[PDB]
RNA sequence: CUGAAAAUACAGUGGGGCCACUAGGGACAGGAUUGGUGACGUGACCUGCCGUAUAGGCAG
């Protein structure tokens, strides 16, 4: 349930992979109300390679990504590509597109995104898949849902000891605080319609309307936690 | 006016060599199947002749 319950294991590599299962998306979310310090130094060693990190608990290399402003750089470049609807499924070739809406009616018969609170995947580019894993990790927060930019949005203050722990300035952590809360994720619609986009024709008022359907993100997110639960 | 239109997976190929299922062996005792029953008559196959002939051939 909490974030140090699963540090009780004494072999790293069981830890850092039930870590790493833990933080994914495909499972339920751990409680860090307790654990913030920990918690940023996992959610930023998270960032680097697999094979690049030995262990996800080694402070001076999560230090040496959060000293270089080329490191948090990328990072908050990744926060821009933050959809709701993941437009990139399951053809790539719609090219450099991002739809972040709210969820729509609720009905009470069919299930949709609207059955769940509002959650964030990201789609842009493999290259930088890591780098989204530090802005984009969902946690359970005092008793709420929750990521890095929105916990950081406003209550900057409960994680600014965690932050300046490692030996980070005030300076730029106030400043990396407004440009996240400056950069977070807008109600993105995409200006044109994609070739590689499907189209169909719905009958309107007198007339008929182009409906593009888009997969979201928290009920694949629910039915991969389901289906790793071997449930169905 | 369909998760919309459109779409050539292909070419080549050595599983081979060797091999002991064996020894032993009681299915056994007893047993009431029994009572009662109409194949035809709405049908064709008849009536005669030849022939020594219930042989064999013939006419309506």
Redesign the pocket.
């Given at each position: 349930m909490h974030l140090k319950e699963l540090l009780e294991i004494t072999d790293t590599t069981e830890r850092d992979r039930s870590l790493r299962r833990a933080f994914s998306p495909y499972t339920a979310m751990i409680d860090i109300t307790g654990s913030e310090a920990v918690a940023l130094i996992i959610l930023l060693n998270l960032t680097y390679r697999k094979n690049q990190v030995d262990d996800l608990l080694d402070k001076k290399l999560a230090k040496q990504a959060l000293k270089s402003e080329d490191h948090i750089n990328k990072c908050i470049k990744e926060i821009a590509w933050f959809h709701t609807h993941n437009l990139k499924?399951?053809?790539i070739r719609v090219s450099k597109q991002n739809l972040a809406v709210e969820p729509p009616t609720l009905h009470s018969y069919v299930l949709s995104s609207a059955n769940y609170p509002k959650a964030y995947g990201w789609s842009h580019n493999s290259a930088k898949v890591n780098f989204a894993k530090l802005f984009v990790s969902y946690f359970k927060w005092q008793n709420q849902v929750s990521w890095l930019a929105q916990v950081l949005a406003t209550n900057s203050d409960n994680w600014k000891s965690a932050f300046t722990s490692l030996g980070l300035s005030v300076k730029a952590f106030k400043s990396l605080c407004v440009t996240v809360k400056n950069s977070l994720p807008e109600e993105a619609i995409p200006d044109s319609v994609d070739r590689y986009?499907?189209?169909?024709?719905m009958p309107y008022h007198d007339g008929?309307l182009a409906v593009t359907?888009?997969?979201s993100h928290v009920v694949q997110s629910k039915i991969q936690q389901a289906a790793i639960d071997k449930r169905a």
């Open positions: 499924y399951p053809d986009s499907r189209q169909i024709r008929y359907p888009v997969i």
